[PDB]
């Protein structure tokens, strides 16, 4: 059956759907199609492409109001790097607070850690009942479960400005450097290439926390 309406969706929307490079990218939702007890959502992306996705693989082009984001929510998020932007899944790991300065914490479905605004965050409209359920990766997918279903109950590692520590990279240990501190998150030097990534303080890439 084709359908025009479904729960808060409607035909025309302005939409994200996920591409098969794993990004995010506006389009219209054109065409609401039931197969079965399921439901199938077509997309027109502004650039190129049409796909007929599942509802978790698209996203509200408007922003959650803070009350309905909680710890686990599945959301699309711009992640900023300082020379690229990229809209990517991820999970809600901490809401706004004096501690974090009022910032939203996503864990993002390749295991990379950002806080974002509430401007910078969209809901996906039909997540798993179980919100990690549909992470790619085996490893990034048991991590967001225990944490979630643990919280707040969340080991993390001190670390200060200066202090040189083992940081994992493709399975192995490097020399680098605590740049800076951020809430629970640590920018981290690595020495051989001087590239600096922000990693969650409670992630087992940092050897404190691996050994802790
Ligand atoms: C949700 C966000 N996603 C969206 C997909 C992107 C996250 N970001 C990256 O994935 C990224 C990470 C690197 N990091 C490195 O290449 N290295 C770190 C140090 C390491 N070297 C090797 C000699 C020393 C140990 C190399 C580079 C570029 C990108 Cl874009």
Same mark, same amino acid.
């Given at each position: 059956?084709?359908?025009?309406?479904?729960?808060?969706? *409607?035909?025309? #929307?302005?939409?994200?759907?996920?591409?098969? @490079?794993?990004?995010?990218?506006?389009?219209?939702?054109?065409?609401?199609?039931?197969?079965?007890?399921?439901?199938?959502?077509?997309?027109?992306?502004?650039?190129?492409?049409?796909?007929?996705? /599942?509802?978790?693989?698209?996203?509200?082009?408007?922003?959650?109001?803070?009350?309905?984001?909680?710890?686990?929510?599945?959301?699309?998020?711009?992640?900023?790097?300082?020379?690229?932007?990229?809209?990517?899944?991820?999970?809600?790991?901490? @809401?706004?607070?004096?501690?974090?300065?009022?910032?939203?914490?996503?864990?993002?479905?390749?295991?990379?850690?950002?806080?974002?605004?509430? /401007?910078?965050?969209?809901? *996906?409209?039909?997540? $798993?009942?179980?919100?990690?359920?549909?992470?790619?990766?085996?490893?990034?997918?048991?991590? *967001?479960?225990?944490?979630? @279903?643990?919280?707040?109950?969340?080991? #993390?590692?001190?670390?200060?400005?200066?202090?040189?520590?083992?940081?994992?990279?493709?399975?192995?240990?490097?020399? /680098?450097?605590?740049?800076?501190?951020?809430? /629970? $998150?640590?920018?981290?030097?690595?020495?051989?290439?001087?590239?600096?990534?922000?990693?969650?303080?409670?992630? @087992?890439?940092?050897?404190? #926390?691996?050994? #802790?």
């Amino acid at each position: 059956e084709n359908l025009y309406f479904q729960g808060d969706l *409607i035909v025309s #929307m302005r939409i994200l759907g996920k591409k098969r @490079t794993k990004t995010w990218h506006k389009g219209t939702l054109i065409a609401i199609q039931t197969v079965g007890p399921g439901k199938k959502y077509k997309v027109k992306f502004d650039n190129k492409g049409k796909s007929l996705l /599942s509802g978790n693989h698209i996203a509200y082009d408007y922003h959650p109001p803070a009350d309905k984001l909680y710890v686990g929510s599945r959301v699309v998020a711009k992640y900023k790097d300082g020379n690229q932007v990229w809209l990517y899944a991820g999970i809600v790991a901490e @809401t706004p607070n004096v501690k974090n300065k009022l910032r939203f914490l996503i864990f993002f479905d390749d295991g990379y850690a950002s806080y974002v605004t509430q /401007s910078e965050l969209y809901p *996906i409209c039909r997540p $798993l009942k179980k919100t990690w359920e549909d992470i790619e990766d085996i490893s990034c997918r048991d991590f *967001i479960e225990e944490y979630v @279903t643990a919280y707040p109950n969340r080991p #993390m590692v001190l670390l200060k400005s200066g202090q040189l520590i083992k940081t994992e990279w493709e399975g192995t240990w490097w020399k /680098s450097r605590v740049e800076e501190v951020d809430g /629970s $998150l640590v920018r981290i030097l690595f020495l051989d290439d001087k590239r600096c990534e922000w990693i969650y303080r409670g992630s @087992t890439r940092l050897e404190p #926390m691996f050994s #802790m």
